[PDB]
Amino acid sequence: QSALTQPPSVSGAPGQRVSISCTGGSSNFGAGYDVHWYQQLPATAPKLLIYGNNNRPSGVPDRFSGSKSGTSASLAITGLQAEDEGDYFCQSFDTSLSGWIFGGGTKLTVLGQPKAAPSVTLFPPSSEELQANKATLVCLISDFYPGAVTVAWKADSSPVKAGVETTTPSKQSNNKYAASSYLSLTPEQWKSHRSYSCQVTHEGSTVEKTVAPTEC
């Protein structure tokens, strides 16, 4: 590989221990360059958290600890505090691209309420929309905590990543989260498949809903 991989969501009770894994390619971590960690608190600039695998700048609490062995690095956070809630990503250097590389980012949530798996509804293109020579699949996601999901579309059994436009989660009025994802298609492609499927992943479970052109 030539890029870093992280879990999208990591949760923890106040005071517990959590972990975040950064997976690297041979061209990066197997290339002698150490891993850096940065935290991005809400509406703040990214802060240098851990430099040189396990070193800590003066100002970062000792609760954050770093490790790296082989090709996988892990960031440990003991005694989870509400101040830690934010986004975290890893950084390294790649020799095949001769440049820097970053990770997908991990949202750390400090639990303030019990978890809730998302409820999902999939919507086919409307009749008025198809008469306007347009087609859009609407995947609605609501009432989930912590607020971080991963949406994957697929035409029939094969995955599709083109035309996907997913929204970031937004806190509802009852401290839960809602999101949505849209798959823009031509009316030709819609009737050119037996079914479409929206796939939502959240805290160790994936729910999938399916709609067919012939359905209703």
Binding site: A45, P46, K47, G52, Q91, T121, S127, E128, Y182, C216
Partner: protein
Amino acid sequence: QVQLVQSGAEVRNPGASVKVSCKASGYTFTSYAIHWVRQAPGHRLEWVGRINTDNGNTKYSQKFHGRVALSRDTSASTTYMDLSSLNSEDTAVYYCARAFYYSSGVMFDSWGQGALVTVSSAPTKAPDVFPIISGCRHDNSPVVLACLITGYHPTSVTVTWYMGTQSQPQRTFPEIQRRDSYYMTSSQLSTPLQQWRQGEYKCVVQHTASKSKKEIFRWPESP
């Protein structure tokens, strides 16, 4: 203290240019290199380039190629990023970081606040509202009513569902900018529907930026 400050937010049209600054203070401006990193909505961070703040040597990311230029003015204590031939994918927040040394390599120990750049070529337009539905009216599967609200600018819209005269609970969903710089969002009637009534429920969409109220009170029979 080491601190980096950048220019304010910029809004441009597709295919144009933008020049964002990155002013340094609290250390020797020519001693440590400055990098540039951007992050698009829904993507990870992406490295742009490194500029040698002494002799002026620049190293750019291969993905950007001839699109970007990094300049220096030692007297001004500022680095610039000039990006040409913009498009919808360039809507992002652009950061600058300082390169600091440590016992085994290079380190980014200071980041700027970031500058938001929006590539939007959209006039003030009222939204289109389509009635979308989940389930058949032909099954005992519950029916979920929603309204699809796409093709407007700028944010935001205000939705309210009605059963006759009384307001009905709804679900609010975020608004996302499309590739064509237009926005779209959805609203869903909360309670699933047991029976079928015609014209009883209705969603009302209000967009004060264009002084318009568009409401739908009929879900056509399915295709």
